Amino acid sequence: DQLTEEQIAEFKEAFSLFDKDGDGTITTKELGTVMRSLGQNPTEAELQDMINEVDADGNGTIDFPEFLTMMARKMKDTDSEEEIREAFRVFDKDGNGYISAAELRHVMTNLGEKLTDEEVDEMIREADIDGDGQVNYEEFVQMMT
Amino acid sequence: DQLTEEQIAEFKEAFSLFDKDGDGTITTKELGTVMRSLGQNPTEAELQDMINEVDADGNGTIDFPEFLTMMARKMKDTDSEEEIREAFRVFDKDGNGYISAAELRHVMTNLGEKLTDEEVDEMIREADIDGDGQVNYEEFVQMMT
Amino acid sequence: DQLTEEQIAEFKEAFSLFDKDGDGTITTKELGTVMRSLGQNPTEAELQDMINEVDADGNGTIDFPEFLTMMARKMKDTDSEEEIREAFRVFDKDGNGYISAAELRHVMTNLGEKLTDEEVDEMIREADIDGDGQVNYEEFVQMMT
Amino acid sequence: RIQKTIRGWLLRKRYLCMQRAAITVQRYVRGYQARCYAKFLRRTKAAT
Known part of the structure; x- marks a missing residue:
């Protein structure tokens, strides 16, 4: 409440x-x-x-x-889960809730006003990433709201 | 039992x-x-x-x-040293090797488990500190071990 | 009675x-x-x-x-017969039953109800102290009884 | 909206970790003081 x-x-x-x-x-x-x-x-x-x-x-x-x-x-x-989902969904090549970990770096660090080396290192250490493939973004919608 | x-x-x-x-x-x-x-x-x-x-x-x-x-x-x-040493490594994120006594006073008083001014004055007195206020957290842990 | x-x-x-x-x-x-x-x-x-x-x-x-x-x-x-042994147990130098003369000065002159200078003289003459030294507490209790 | 969300969540996670770390140190400090006061109490009772 x-x-x-x-x-x-x-x-x-x-x-x-x-x-x-x-x-x-x-x-x-x-x-x-x-x-x-x-x-x-x-x-x-x-x-x-x-x-x-x-x-x-x-x-x-x-x-x-x-x-x-x-x-x-x-x-x-204040935002909503579907409004945040819309923001990821315009980058979905397939239509199944997954986005490329390569194009995610392009979205994080080249497009927009951008995330720093520290923000990248911290997030990538927790997310454990070693590759460029498709990865689930419905998790991101839930966990970051 | x-x-x-x-x-x-x-x-x-x-x-x-x-x-x-x-x-x-x-x-x-x-x-x-x-x-x-x-x-x-x-x-x-x-x-x-x-x-x-x-x-x-x-x-x-x-x-x-x-x-x-x-x-x-x-x-x-059982509470062991390395838990507390890791907790200090959250604050010293850039690896400087020390923490300001003034920052430590403010944080230990006004956030979380909240040490009163009596508790904080005695805490700062039990620490080892360089000559302009830089707290040597490793030596403070060693003196409690 | x-x-x-x-x-x-x-x-x-x-x-x-x-x-x-x-x-x-x-x-x-x-x-x-x-x-x-x-x-x-x-x-x-x-x-x-x-x-x-x-x-x-x-x-x-x-x-x-x-x-x-x-x-x-x-x-x-109660006669303090247990209580005086519990007291002396704290001031043993190494756990073999022997109070240190250094600790004994803090016990005489800092902690608790203390002792005045001309009756600290009495304990020094009772214990035959001319430098660093020690005393067995079971024997010293037996003497004070 | 993505960059905003990530930056927000990283600061949220860092604040939660900072408060947890503070509590973790403070409980141990208050414990060390409680032990030092117990040590003072046995020594002052004993000397008396």
């Missing part, structure tokens, strides 16, 4: 990691870091526009209540 | 510090301390769960065989 | 050393002295517990029957 006071307790926990002076405030510079640590998923430009709506300098601070405003703003605009 | 004989001896050794009457029982508040004295490191949560397997009373006590026959149903597994 | 006439005579002689009027009262400062002169074995904090019933700052006065009332309960308490 989302956005009840229980869920706001872990939002205070994760916020307290970045309120290093301990006054109820965090910098704009880590706002994406805390939101994605809590597992809510904004894009880069979206986050930057949400920061620059608060300050044209971009370099500033946000108090705990208005951090909860920014969390609620993203929660109103 | 019991732990293996060599562990009964160490449990009797520990329990002798917490009996206050010489009559084989302990007042309910001492229960967490005696358990952590064994070398096992249960969470606050594990100690709160364990009370539901014990059936304690605020108008009563826990006898030596009541405590031992609880442990004979289930006890906490 | 408690309180044959001769018991009261022996205990009243020990008290009559300290009263300087013959009115049946002493200063609270000598309460520990008369008690230990008869070989009764309380802690300083155990004397302090009783003194909170009678003294404004540690300079008051107290009757023979008040002293004898405290003594009457202390005379049914």
